[PDB]
């Protein structure tokens, strides 16, 4: 039908990043199935901490708190550092 | 040279997508049961035999020979002590061969 | 009985894309039962995804879900 | 007028596809607007730390069309993407070059 | 063709492997670093 | 240009060529072939995606390309270069993959 | 002339009429047998288990 | 208060059934707790997936059928399957 | 309506049916937890429940004494090559370790 | 302080032979010692991610085993 | 005589159910590996009794991993080697 995903996402960072670059079919193939792979160990590991918890709620700390324990090293403080700017952003922007 | 030279469209598949030739026997079936049938009539499917009112009598499968036992193990049928020798040595691939040659259980 | 056609010389090639510096000539017979034996898991959990979807094809999601739950988990196929 | 929920958090990435695929995910039946803003963004500095390494890998290897021998060399230069991947594989990325020491002759 | 610099770049890997002068892979700028990779480069300097 | 060589001289250039590309070291067909055994003993007459073939072919080198450098690693530990199966064995067992 | 089963008792399953089904070795072969009901009320009855070895006058 | 909501009674009943004999210690309760627990989130975690990947919004018996046939080795999948099948044949009557 | 029973009770099962589908219904696995589900998984984990109790209480038995001790479960798990796969990388509260060595160890 | 030394060579001694091992040489102890503290670290430090999020200062015996169940080294007879 | 009495120590901890590491050096080694991640931690009573279990199996695991290595090289004697080959094969790091 539509393939629900997220190829035009990626070409946009990758031409953010190096916008004289181009990308094979293949490499976006990894690239899509490595972001779906990532959403569904992170969401997965928020909803454990939710029942953990006794929450129902998926706020940010969990999606943090599961980035966190998923990342390794200074991965995990970058990652964490570029999610809490973005939510800075969007709860200053209304 | 032959009987024809523009033999009509009968109703196979000219240019769609299914198969080239007409409906398969199984939806003759299917669209010949939706026709004005009265109960009495010679419908092609009616003409089926019953089911066996017997219990069908155990042949065994290495040898054709009456079988009392069945094994644990490959559900083959057998009749002798011999024939049980040589079914235990059987490779699987004749194995699911003889219970899907009376389509027994084995897919 | 397909397996003797993975090659001794396709062996060699695979093993030293792993950097060892010789061979034994056991390896060849043994890699060819590891192979069978990985296929003999991945493939009858493909199968258990494809029954489970009602298919008689077996997809690249049916594999990648085995190969997921086998914890190998290849990028590339699927999404 | 409306605003893109993702121009509004400044990522390129999906936050209500992300909003939608937690939603429809069944991973709660409550969802909080923040937790796809911080996802995506995860998703995009991940995305954008890789392609970085990879482009790099391309240019420095004589190249430039990205192909998954790039990807591979980008995972597996650095220790945080190694250990992160580890195990999962990448479709003709191949093993990053190792010709063993010891091995490698006197 | 041009493959002759692939050839070359053969002969340059040959004669470190001659001298025995290659890395532990067998392999022959911190402006290619990422802020991540900067401030772990800066965990390795501290 | 030289004949007969020091062994492993050419062994040196099989693992740069092959760890340089990135090519499938066993041909197609044999592959092919060997998928459509595995599952009928489980399932008959199973059908196989163009996919799905290639990505089990992906898997199965990418499996063995691992197990090949633990192999590696063992024989190195055990004093020899020449790989054995029982250096296969302490690499699956240290692994948790049978035994 | 007489039929007798014998054999090792391998496996017994009993359920509800009532449905079962016995298995038996010797030291030469195997066999997996449905019962009919007037086995059930004596494999039952004289309480059968998996290991004993035993002698079935099959008419009676 | 919060309450324990554990499988104690139901483990103990199935001793009970097979060694009627022996006992269950305060610590081997503990064990058998955790690997009931563990199991139902291994099985309930896969037939999740199951549902999704096949993008079907129920869970049944033929979703938690296929996580018994992947999660349990050998002899184990086939008895837990008939286990199964013979508790819903009477359950549907 | 006169007297209420278990869907345990319908489904000859010990295994709580109610309390599986509460589980199930409440640990988001589905939108839809259809009835046939908790019936068919208390009936799977009653019988991992009865294969995994009685190896406990043979190995209990074997080592003589009438009570499953977490000592007795390890001696039945590690003497078990299926529920060595399925426990294959859980750890035994008061377990210890299945008594063994390589040959090569022993003396003269 | 110092008290990755606290695992004694007696204890390693012990520990090692449940494992079955016939020699220690006496080079083994410091690494054992390292890797142990390495194996804590990393279970510590996912029990202290998982009580910093339930907003509470006692790490709980549930808090290890959430971390050994995200490392997939899991324990039990502890609860869950 | 000597490796003999090392040799019959193995059966005794085999059979034997107890802990051998001692509890206060542990509990004080789990606060210390804790500091730097967090101070003023409070730990309760049975999590470093589930961490020590923990312990104890990962190293009673990687001492069978530590035997087959040097076996495998036909010592009866262990060395530091024999870890770094397990802890690379096993995935960990």
């Known amino acids: ?94 | 040279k032959d009987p024809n030279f523009v033999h009509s469209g009968h109703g196979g598949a000219v240019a769609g997508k299914k198969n080239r030739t007409w409906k398969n026997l199984k939806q003759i079936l299917a669209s010949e049961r939706a026709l004005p049938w009265q109960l009495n009539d010679p419908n092609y499917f009616s003409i089926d035999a019953p089911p066996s009112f017997k219990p069908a009598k155990k042949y065994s499968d290495v040898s054709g020979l009456l079988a009392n036992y069945t094994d644990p193990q490959s559900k083959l049928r057998f009749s002798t002590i011999e024939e049980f020798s040589y079914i235990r040595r059987l490779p699987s691939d004749v194995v699911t061969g003889y219970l899907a040659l009376r389509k027994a259980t084995s897919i | 009985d397909n397996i003797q056609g993975i090659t001794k010389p396709a062996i060699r090639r695979l093993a030293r894309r792993g950097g060892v510096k010789r061979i034994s000539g056991l390896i060849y017979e043994e890699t060819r039962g590891v192979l069978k034996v990985f296929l003999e898991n991945v493939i009858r959990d493909a199968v258990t995804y494809t029954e489970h979807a009602k298919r008689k094809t077996v997809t690249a999601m049916d594999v990648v879900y085995a190969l997921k739950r086998q914890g190998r988990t290849l990028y590339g196929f699927g999404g | 007028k409306a605003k893109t929920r993702s121009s509004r958090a400044g990522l390129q990435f999906p936050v209500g596809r992300v909003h939608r695929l937690l939603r429809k995910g069944n991973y709660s039946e409550r969802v909080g607007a923040g937790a796809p803003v911080y996802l995506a963004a995860v998703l995009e500095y991940l995305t954008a730390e890789i392609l970085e390494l990879a482009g790099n890998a391309a240019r420095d290897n004589k190249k430039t069309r990205i192909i998954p021998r790039h990807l591979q060399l980008a995972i597996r230069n650095d220790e945080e993407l190694n250990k992160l991947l580890g195990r999962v594989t990448i479709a003709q990325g191949g093993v990053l070059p190792n010709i063993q020491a010891v091995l490698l002759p006197k | 063709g041009l493959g002759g610099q692939e050839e070359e770049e053969e002969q340059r890997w040959l004669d470190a492997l001659e001298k025995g002068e290659l890395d532990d892979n067998g392999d022959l700028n911190e402006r290619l670093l990422t802020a991540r990779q900067r401030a772990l480069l800066q965990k390795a300097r501290s | 240009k030289p004949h007969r060589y020091r062994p492993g001289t050419v062994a040196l250039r099989e693992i740069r060529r092959y760890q340089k590309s990135t090519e499938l070291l066993i041909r197609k067909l044999p592959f092919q072939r060997l998928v459509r055994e595995i599952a009928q003993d489980f399932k008959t007459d199973l059908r196989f995606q163009s996919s799905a073939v290639m990505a089990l072919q992906e898997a199965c080198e990418a499996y063995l390309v691992g197990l090949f450098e633990d192999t590696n690693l063992c024989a190195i530990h055990a004093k020899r270069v020449t790989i054995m199966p029982k250096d296969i064995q302490l690499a699956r067992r240290i692994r948790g993959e049978r035994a | 002339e007489t039929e007798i089963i014998e054999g090792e008792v391998v496996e017994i399953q009993i359920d509800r009429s009532k449905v079962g089904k016995l298995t038996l070795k010797t030291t030469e072969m195997e066999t997996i047998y449905d019962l009919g009901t007037k086995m059930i009320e004596s494999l039952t009855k004289d309480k059968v288990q998996a290991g004993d070895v035993i002698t079935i006058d099959k008419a009676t």
């Open chain 1, 1 to 94: 039908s539509r393939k629900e995903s997220y190829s035009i996402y990626v070409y946009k960072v990758l031409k953010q990043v190096h916008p004289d670059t181009g990308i094979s079919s293949k490499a976006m193939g990894i690239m899509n199935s490595f972001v779906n792979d990532i959403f569904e160990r992170i969401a997965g590991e928020a909803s454990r901490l939710a029942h953990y918890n006794k929450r129902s709620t998926i706020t940010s700390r969990e999606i943090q708190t599961a980035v966190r324990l998923l990342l390794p090293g200074e991965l995990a403080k970058h990652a964490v550092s570029e999610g809490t700017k973005a939510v800075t952003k969007y709860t200053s922007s209304k």
